[PDB]
Design a protein around this nucleic acid. Sequence first.
RNA 1: UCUACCCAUGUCCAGGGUGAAGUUCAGGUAACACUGAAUGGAGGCCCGAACCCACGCACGUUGAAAAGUGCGGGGAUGAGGU
RNA 2: UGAGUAGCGAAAGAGGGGUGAGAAUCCCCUCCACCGAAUGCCUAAGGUUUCCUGAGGAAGGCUCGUCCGCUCAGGGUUAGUCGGGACCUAAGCCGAGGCCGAAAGGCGUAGGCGAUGGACAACAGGUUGAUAUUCCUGUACCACCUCCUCACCAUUUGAGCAAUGGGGGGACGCAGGAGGAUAGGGUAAGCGCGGUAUUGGAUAUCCGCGUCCAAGCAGUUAGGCUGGGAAAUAGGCAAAUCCGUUUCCCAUAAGCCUGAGCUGUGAUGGCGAGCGAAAUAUAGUAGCGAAGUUCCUGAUUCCACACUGCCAAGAAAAGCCUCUAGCGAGGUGAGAGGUGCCCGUACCGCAAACCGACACAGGUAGGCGAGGAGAGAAUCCUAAGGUGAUCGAGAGAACUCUCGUUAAGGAACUCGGCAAAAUGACCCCGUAACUUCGGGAGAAGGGGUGCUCUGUUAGGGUGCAAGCCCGAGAGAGCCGCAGUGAAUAGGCCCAGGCGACUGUUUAGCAAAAACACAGGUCUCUGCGAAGCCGUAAGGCGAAGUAUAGGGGCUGACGCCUAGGCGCAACGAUCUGGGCACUGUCUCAACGAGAGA
RNA 3: GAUAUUGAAUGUCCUUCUAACCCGCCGCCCUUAUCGGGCGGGGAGACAGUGUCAGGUGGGCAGUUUGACU
RNA 4: AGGGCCAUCGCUCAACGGAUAAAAGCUACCCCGG
Lengths: 44, 267
Amino acid sequence: MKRTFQPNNRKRSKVHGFRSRMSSKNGRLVLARRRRKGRKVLSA
Amino acid sequence: AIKKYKPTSNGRRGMTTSDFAEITTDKPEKSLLAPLHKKGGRNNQGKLTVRHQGGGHKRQYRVIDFKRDKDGIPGRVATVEYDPNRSANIALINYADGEKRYILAPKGIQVGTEIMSGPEADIKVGNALPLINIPVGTVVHNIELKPGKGGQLVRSAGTSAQVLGKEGKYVLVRLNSGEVRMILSACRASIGQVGNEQHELINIGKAGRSRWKGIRPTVRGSVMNPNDHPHGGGKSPMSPWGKPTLGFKTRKKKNKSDKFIVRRRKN
RNA sequence: UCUACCCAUGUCCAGGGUGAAGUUCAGGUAACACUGAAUGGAGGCCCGAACCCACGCACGUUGAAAAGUGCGGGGAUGAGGU
RNA sequence: UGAGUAGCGAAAGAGGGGUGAGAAUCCCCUCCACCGAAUGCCUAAGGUUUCCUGAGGAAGGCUCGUCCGCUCAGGGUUAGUCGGGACCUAAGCCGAGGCCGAAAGGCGUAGGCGAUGGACAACAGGUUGAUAUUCCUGUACCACCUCCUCACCAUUUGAGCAAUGGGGGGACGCAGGAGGAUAGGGUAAGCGCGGUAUUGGAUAUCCGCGUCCAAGCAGUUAGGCUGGGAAAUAGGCAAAUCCGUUUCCCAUAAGCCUGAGCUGUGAUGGCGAGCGAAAUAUAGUAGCGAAGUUCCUGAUUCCACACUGCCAAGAAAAGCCUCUAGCGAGGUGAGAGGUGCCCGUACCGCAAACCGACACAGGUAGGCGAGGAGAGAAUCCUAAGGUGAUCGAGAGAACUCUCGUUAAGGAACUCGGCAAAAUGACCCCGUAACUUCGGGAGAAGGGGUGCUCUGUUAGGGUGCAAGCCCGAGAGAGCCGCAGUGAAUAGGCCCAGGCGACUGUUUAGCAAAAACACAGGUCUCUGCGAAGCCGUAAGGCGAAGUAUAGGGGCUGACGCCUAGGCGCAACGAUCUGGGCACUGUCUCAACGAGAGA
RNA sequence: GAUAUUGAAUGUCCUUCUAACCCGCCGCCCUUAUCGGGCGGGGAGACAGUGUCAGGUGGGCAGUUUGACU
RNA sequence: AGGGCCAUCGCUCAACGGAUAAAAGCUACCCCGG
């Protein structure tokens, strides 16, 4: 009855954010990839 | 003593409980408390390491002295309270000087009686002094292994050890549960047996009463799926991880405390 | 961000019934035990809404719905729900 | 192609006017119907312009459309006091030095960050097409400043200020029953209306109304303190006149800190039934305005986690108050005048604006939540308020589904009384074999309940009174086929077997007889414990210490010993038997609604 | 068990002190700090831990396999 | 040193033309094809 998606902004920015991609070594790789492809929206 | 509930239900049939006879107050000492939060048996990596723990009633840590460095000051007893963390029940002592403190309560203590802690203190019922002054053949508790640390052994409810040999700087003691040992010289020791000794006469009565204490259920190894246990599906005893625990001593083959153990319990 | 367990801090549970320990006067005995009154208000207690389950039957199965609706059923101050 | 076929997604509308090229579907009116512990109002997460006005008729609305949560142009969101930041901290996260590791990296001290919690100054009315504790009109409160005016202290033998430090305080569980109030809800004064055309009423008749803030002065139920006073002080790193500790005098009243509320003032104010204009860019708006009291009932809210009981013993830090260290030459206390930043603010929040692909019979924290009968937030009908649910017309065939009634028999049907019928509400009488003495037990089985009169009964609550409110139990009488006259509410009884019990688990697959449980029993562990996670540092075990911890096997209690006995209690348990009952059946027949 | 970390005297590997080395013991400063280390004290000590090197225990942990006829 | 050439020794490779220095069972929870 209850679905697998219930929205929230805090829990989004705190996990898929930019300051949490950039605070690692692999997250920086994700950013470099998505800049290589050419994407418009790098991080959530 | 203990009181036995009347069976006006199914889940309150065998249940008995302490009667809290000796408690003299229902409030703690506000200036001697510290916070304490549950852990659930979870490591510093969040990974569950010990099973069968977690969840209960909220508690708080009550300051209790275990070194008794305040020697040469006669102090008296004021109250005897309840302590959720220990098994015995602690006592609040006010010194004649002004500083308050907590101590373990021996068997039979009475509010008013002063307590000494110096080397020249005379053996009584609630005093603490170095072992190289205690007579031979006396009951004692709250013992310590390195002089200057604080009691660690025999700090349970009802327990008591026995001091019977005094060699060169190595007065040897008999801990609870046999295992006669030879602890160091200058360490301190409390004279007397600890209190609230009926603590081994309690029916927890019902399944939910353990959960108030913080003990989660246990899943038996005989009912398991094949790929966790050598009992699952459907010789030598084993363990969730592998241990032949039916007569294998787990104490180290070689250790550092070997020169100080004279005879062992060995059942 | 669904679901399992745990940690911190909040919040919710219409009404009704039974009547334990104890206490005060009685018999009551050596006081007791033990039998009577009044007072008291325990409980993984009882009947039952909100809430939580999804046990039964029927209807739906190119469904209103990729698991629901109607009529019953269990718990409902707790090892409770959120 | 199937095919102009299946579907058209719970539900009450009808008629009269209007605009329009065009109307079952849009607007206005009048009756009628549905929700009313919500289908009412207010405010979170989330959404992001959906909000208001003027145009529109390509596409989207399961039909239509002149309408729209759709398209095109404009417009709209105002804060010293509300929520968040220039305040504080929990779990957790980051982490200078530092410790580990082939490297990448892992852990962690000081120190920070982090509300779901603690601190903290504003209320009542009015108004626009669209905002209101923000704008406007009344009255307020808080912090900080001094070109200013008063008053009183001060001269280093010192008036004042005062910690980043020490104390006090903030400061905390669950249940139960009193008390005292008030929000709310109903009679008697009073006020404006009214006179009824269907037989009757100037009547003990009918309709509607009615009050009021924060703040500032006064006093107050209650409450706690377990009494305050003096002196001396090996402790609170230093200090102390504060706190703590001890011994002396009176204390049972002085004092202490708290408080729900109530009476004046705010208020020569503003709301208020209801009257009523212009015409206006064709309003029930501008405008005017009566009375505005006592009585009865009363919380699920407040005093207040206050009191009592119990054990499973119930967060931290800051604002605040004091203490000296320390600063010092000018200060304290009133008035008068000033200063007060950033972010959110419309609108939907039980819904066609959020999550489910859809305008989807689903899901969505909290705060209020009225009346009659009632124990009640149950049940039926209604108030304030909201709604007409987005395809229709007519015909009343077989058949499918959801409902109602039935002759005579009643389980004869079937693997199996699956399903449906009967009982159920209060009050009295009465209540067995067994029993782990509590239970079994609402056991089983019996009887009464409507209206009127004596009756404002006996009696009870409130008040001086008058007057309101709750009410047994008895007599006499009246009616019906029938009096818990409708809706909502246990079917019972024997005999055995299993599991002690409450609980958890196969929800996009089945439940018990499976898992767990209180208790028993074995075994390891002397504390840097054993055992666990990690390469290791670091941790859980535990701020624990053999009456304590980790690992196995079994499962209450009582007898009889690692065998066996006892069902009492409890099951959406299992297997047989009996009463009441019924369209399950002999054997089917009419009627209603949806589809066809 | 072997080896290297690894000190000194009687005894033949017997007694023996400690300055190597180890302390999840006490005090003081860096420092406002339960981390870390610097100095003092106590306890133990040629042990213990450690690198290499020579065996056993090792479903603890892996990789795999087990013909044709009918 | 070792190697070659010439006589010659080592096997139930017994599945005997010999895939090797050496190899067991369960899986209508199971997974993929003719």
